[PDB]
């Protein structure tokens, strides 16, 4: 079960391969590669991105509220007189 000699029992399968020296290292990396990457990105965009956008909104508001708190209070001095 841990040696290539005996791992599983398969039947009726064929495989075809070519030598590394008989083929290009970057085949269709301009017409077929980029579109596949775009498919990958698009297929998982809405599953991740939006949550991290919420994080950014929480981060900005926080900082804004923190600084907003340190501003002096005109309502604590109107009557101080």
């Amino acid at each position: 079960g841990r040696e290539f000699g005996n791992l599983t029992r398969m039947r009726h399968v064929i495989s075809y391969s070519l030598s590394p020296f008989e083929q290009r290292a970057y085949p269709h990396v301009f017409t077929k590669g980029i579109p596949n990457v775009l498919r990958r990105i698009r297929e998982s965009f809405f599953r991740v991105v939006p949550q991290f956008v919420v994080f950014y909104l929480i981060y900005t508001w926080g900082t804004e509220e923190f600084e907003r708190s340190k501003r002096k209070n005109p309502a604590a001095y109107e009557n101080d007189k």
Binding site: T8, M10, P20
Partner: protein, 80 residues
């Protein structure tokens, strides 16, 4: 030993003519064999075998056959 009998000789005649056009006599083979030397064998084998790209084919319970990169790496020595 292959040429014993009349069938092997006629087959040799027919096959040899189609390729060479002439029946190369046996005495000519021995002359060419004598030219063979250890230096000659090494040069020719290095010419046609060393660091080449083999073709492979396996029909069997073959899960342990090394991948093509393992075989291609075994086509040459690093000690050499």
């Amino acid at each position: 030993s292959h040429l014993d009998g009349t069938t092997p000789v006629c087959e040799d005649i027919g096959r040899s003519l189609l390729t060479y056009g002439r029946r190369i006599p046996l005495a000519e083979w021995e002359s060419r064999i004598a030219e063979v030397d250890a230096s000659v064998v090494r040069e020719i084998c290095s010419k046609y075998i060393y660091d080449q790209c083999p073709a492979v084919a396996g029909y069997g319970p073959i899960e342990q056959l090394p991948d093509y990169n393992r075989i291609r790496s075994g086509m040459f020595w690093l000690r050499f």
